[PDB]
Design a binder for this molecule. Structure first.
Ligand SMILES: CC(=O)N[C@@H]1[C@@H](O)[C@H](O[C@@H]2O[C@H](CO)[C@@H](O)[C@H](O)[C@H]2NC(C)=O)[C@@H](CO)O[C@H]1O
Ligand SMILES: *[C@@H]1O[C@H](CO)[C@@H](O)[C@H](O)[C@H]1NC(C)=O
Ligand SMILES: *[C@@H]1O[C@H](CO)[C@@H](O)[C@H](O)[C@H]1NC(C)=O
Length: 383
């Protein structure tokens, strides 16, 4: 009854060489819930925005994805609306009035019917966030959107699920999330327990520490997976609605000039924007798990690998490059911790960044860990 929630990135198909990851690459049997990311919302009409129509519609992306249920009928296939790149202003605008929300709700219902999805994952980052085009009113109005979507899903009579991806920082919760009301309307809360540290913070650190470290101060004090999930509980979310996010990627940094200190919290060249891009994801500031393991785990690697004893995460560095991530050791620790706490399951961002090619050894090694622990686990009643 535990969940293994797999976010699937529709843009991963454009990665060159062995990075190429399409619908056919999804290890469907390792997941209980798979989420096609992303669709968006239009600025002008508050309707569903199809972001890559040539892929999603013309090449039958949406339907290829949902058709996987023929061979795997136990698995739920949903779609996610939003994501970071979509921005927050169009969503704040969409929820501002009852009329615009109902327009979106209708559009959503038509879309889900048309492409045979099992429901919707909400990925607005974030209601109430001034840095994301949000405002104070978003908190009530996001709740209204959620209530209105749930009611529409009920009226359709197909048992569609409604879920949401959420942050764990307290200030974000206060600004955007009516926790008890949201958790009762949603089938699951996909907690984004990653990107907790990164170039934007001005220092090198792992981005999904499980527990507090000594250098964690002020806003960062409780910004860890354990305390963050505890925060969701304290604000009124039942343990059996909480799904814990696991990143299949690392956050990278370029260290400051002449800096020979590689410890957690060391100063960085923030203007660099992060570590140098890797060959497949091609982005400053992060590496896919498979880009990390092919560099760090080879026999003749010049990388130095270390372990965060409190956060329970690996980090590795070479020259000016520093990357914090998750490996099988750290993932295993989180799986056991999930079961100990009694949470609903594990989520990954994102399945397309696992070592699906087995470049480093075993294919799909990280998702195999999630599946192994969750499939043998019974979620206890709410605490
Ligand atoms: C709701 C939310 O904040 N979703 C986050 C993701 O958007 C984000 O992944 C990022 O998605 C972008 C598209 O919206 C991509 O442009 C970007 O490359 C991608 N970044 C990574 C590292 O995959 C992830 C991770 O930052 O957090 C999600 O929960
Ligand atoms: C969908 O499946 C068809 C038939 O195998 C394939 O030709 C097409 O490329 C697939 N589309 C996507 C987006 O994966
Ligand atoms: C890779 O990303 C960089 C950003 O630094 C961009 O300039 C370049 O066009 C990208 N290359 C490919 C082949 O995607």
């Amino acid at each position: 009854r535990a969940r293994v929630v797999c976010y699937f990135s529709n843009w991963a198909v454009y990665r060159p060489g062995v990075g190429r990851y399409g619908i056919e690459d999804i290890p469907v049997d390792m997941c209980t819930h798979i989420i096609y990311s992303f669709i968006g919302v239009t600025e002008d009409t508050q309707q569903v925005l199809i972001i890559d129509p040539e892929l999603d519609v013309d090449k039958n992306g949406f339907k290829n994805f949902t058709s996987l249920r023929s061979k795997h009928p136990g698995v739920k296939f949903t779609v996610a609306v939003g994501g970071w790149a979509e921005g927050g202003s169009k969503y704040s605008k969409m929820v501002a009035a009852k009329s615009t929300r109902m327009a979106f709700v209708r559009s959503v219902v038509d879309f889900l019917n048309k492409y045979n999805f099992d429901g919707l994952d909400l990925d607005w980052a974030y209601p109430g966030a001034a840095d994301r085009g949000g405002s104070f009113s978003d908190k009530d109005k996001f709740l209204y959107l959620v209530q209105e979507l749930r009611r529409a899903f009920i009226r359709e009579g197909k048992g569609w699920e409604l879920t949401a991806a959420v942050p764990l920082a307290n200030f974000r919760l206060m600004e955007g999330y009516h926790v008890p009301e949201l958790c009762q309307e949603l089938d699951a809360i996909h907690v984004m327990s990653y990107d907790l540290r990164g170039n934007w913070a001005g220092f090198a650190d792992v981005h999904s520490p499980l527990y507090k470290r000594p250098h964690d101060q002020w806003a960062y004090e409780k910004l860890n997976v354990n305390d963050g999930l505890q925060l969701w509980e304290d604000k009124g979310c039942p343990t059996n609605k909480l799904v814990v996010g696991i990143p299949f990627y690392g956050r990278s940094f370029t260290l400051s000039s002449g800096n020979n200190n590689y410890n957690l919290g060391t100063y960085i060249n923030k203007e660099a924007g992060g570590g140098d891009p890797a060959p497949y994801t091609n982005a400053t500031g992060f590496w896919a798990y498979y880009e990390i393991c092919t560099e760090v785990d080879t026999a003749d690697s010049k990388w130095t690998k270390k372990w965060d004893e409190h956060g329970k995460c690996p980090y590795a560095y070479k020259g000016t490059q520093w990357v914090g991530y998750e490996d099988p050791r750290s993932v295993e620790i989180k799986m056991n911790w999930i079961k100990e706490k009694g949470y609903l399951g594990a989520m990954t961002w994102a399945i397309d960044m696992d070592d699906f090619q087995g470049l480093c050894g075993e294919k799909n090694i990280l998702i195999k860990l999630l599946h192994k622990h969750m499939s043998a686990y019974t979620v206890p009643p709410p605490r």
